[PDB]
Design a binder for this molecule. Structure first.
Ligand code: QNU
Ligand code: QNU
Ligand code: CL
Lengths: 300, 305
């Protein structure tokens, strides 16, 4: 029993964290096999940042301009290339701690663990979700760029996020490990704003099933709803539309608890209408949306 | 910016997790140097759990009865002894991945990271607090016994908790790494209940400072209070008493934000008597008490390990 916001054990990723320095800029890199992946903005100066021409800045660099430190050992850079917004630094040593890995691009609503690092040193691990507006509500200070988001399945690490920047609202933007940004963001200090954030409906429903599995049924009701009537109500509370894919995904949890997805959708509509009335669900006074249906099945 | 429930990086502890199987029971062990530490209830089965004489059950076990698996390698047990509610299995091989470590007993209100394991394999890491009633609101299923709680200070891992059991309310009970239970609990299948819990006041204040550091000031007010008047209010809302030690501990956060500890106490008093009024603090509608003052400073300063 119990339900916690739980991160994947970070050990497999800790052994990949390195410090990357180019001039006065220092940030984190991910050392996998003989390549160090890091944000390409490590080649920018604080002023260059408004309209950098990364191809122009990169062509002016040599392998020896990149200082890569793995613990107390300096790695030798023997090549460099740019793939979208990530810089790939070929090094002369394969990381002996390289786990079985994959690069996966995730969709909004997906969750992942973040290993927050400063100067190539892991400082903390927390759990995140890719918001529907493609930002992440992380906890990052200056120097955290290059910190990565990941999931572990079996002994395989799926790297899904690399931290690049903080937006004016305090939320974070980054790329997959192929350098493609999540969201309409660019690695430039130009005026950029996150779109209106919405609640991840499928995740809230999954969390309501987790509460039912943990013995909490107070919020249930005798009502059901159509998918269209649910979405009409959900939209008014800034909740993401629930698609038939989401309904299908909740099938296992619906079968396990005996509560049909549209029956749970009706409990959610009523919770949005009434609030919680001094009650909590799984120790929370708000509806939690950073647990996917997969996380719930895995943890419960 | 941002404030998350953040655990210590678990890598140093992952390299210590092993599977311990004795009879029909399989649980987790902590392999440090040439010793595997695990709950002593691994020697128990069905009849045993009811009324267990652990000295009697342990004396009949041979070393070869404890199957210890470290990854895909079986460790050889060359000795066994019991220290309080923890079983120590002497093995022939020192763990080459043994980090710099200490065994520390923590006090209620102190936080730690838990590396939840099943079959000697780490499955998740989460941050939690030792409640004032000595339970932990963890997330544990069957097979999680032997999972450990820890903090990291520089390069030294301080092991502070070993998971032993789940109480009927879904909360968890365990021991320090010397086998002494936190709380009035015993490792036996019997009627046991967690006492009425209280809110960790110093931790709520620390979290209010974290909210101020992150730009949330709506709850601040012009008022201050005496420590005695605050404690009279706090006792009414099942909040732990705030001592002068707590006030001193919050000094750095008070100096950083310009909000005196007793000034933040008057904010807490108004929040307790009036509520949040539809507003949230750091994305929460409840007052969070599982971040210590040190946790807030560490996260808002970026300390690495
Ligand atoms: O955002 C950035 N860094 C940070 C990243 N994360 C959390 C921070 C918190 C506090 C200060 C900085 C933080 C850098 C620097 N500031 C502008 C900028 C513009 C574009 C790009 Cl791609 C990177 C950056
Ligand atoms: O509590 C225990 N294990 C667990 C531990 N954590 C979370 C669980 C969740 C669900 C089932 C078991 C769980 C064991 C088994 N039940 C009786 C018992 C009595 C005494 C002792 Cl010391 C251990 C135990
Ligand atoms: Cl480093």
């Amino acid at each position: 029993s119990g339900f916690r916001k739980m991160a994947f054990p970070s050990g497999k990723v800790e052994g990949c964290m390195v410090q990357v320095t180019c001039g006065t800029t220092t940030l984190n890199g991910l050392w996998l096999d003989d390549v160090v992946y890091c944000p390409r903005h490590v080649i920018c100066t604080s002023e260059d940042m408004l309209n950098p021409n990364y191809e122009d800045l990169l062509i002016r660099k040599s392998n020896h301009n990149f200082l890569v430190q793995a613990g107390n050992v300096q790695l030798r850079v023997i090549g460099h290339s740019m793939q979208n917004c990530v810089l790939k630094l070929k090094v002369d040593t394969a990381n002996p701690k390289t786990p079985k890995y994959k690069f996966v691009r995730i969709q909004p609503g997906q969750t992942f663990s973040v290993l927050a690092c400063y100067n190539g040193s892991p400082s903390g691990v927390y759990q995140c979700a890719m918001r529907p507006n493609f930002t992440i509500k992380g906890s990052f200070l200056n120097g955290s760029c290059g910190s990565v988001g990941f999931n572990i399945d079996y002994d395989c690490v799926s790297f899904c996020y690399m931290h690049h920047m903080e937006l004016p609202t305090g939320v974070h933007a980054g790329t997959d490990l192929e350098g493609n940004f999540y969201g309409p963001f660019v690695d430039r200090q130009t005026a950029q704003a996150a779109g209106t954030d919405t609640t991840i409906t499928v995740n809230v429903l999954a969390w309501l099933y987790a509460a039912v599995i943990n013995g909490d049924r107070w919020f249930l009701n005798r009502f059901t709803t159509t998918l269209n009537d649910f979405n009409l109500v959900a939209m008014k509370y800034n909740y993401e539309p629930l698609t038939q894919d989401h309904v299908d995904i909740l099938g296992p949890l619906s079968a396990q608890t005996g509560i049909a997805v549209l029956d749970m959708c009706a409990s959610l509509k009523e919770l949005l209408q009434n609030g919680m009335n001094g009650r909590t669900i799984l120790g929370s006074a708000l509806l939690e949306d950073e647990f996917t249906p997969f996380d719930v099945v895995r943890q419960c």
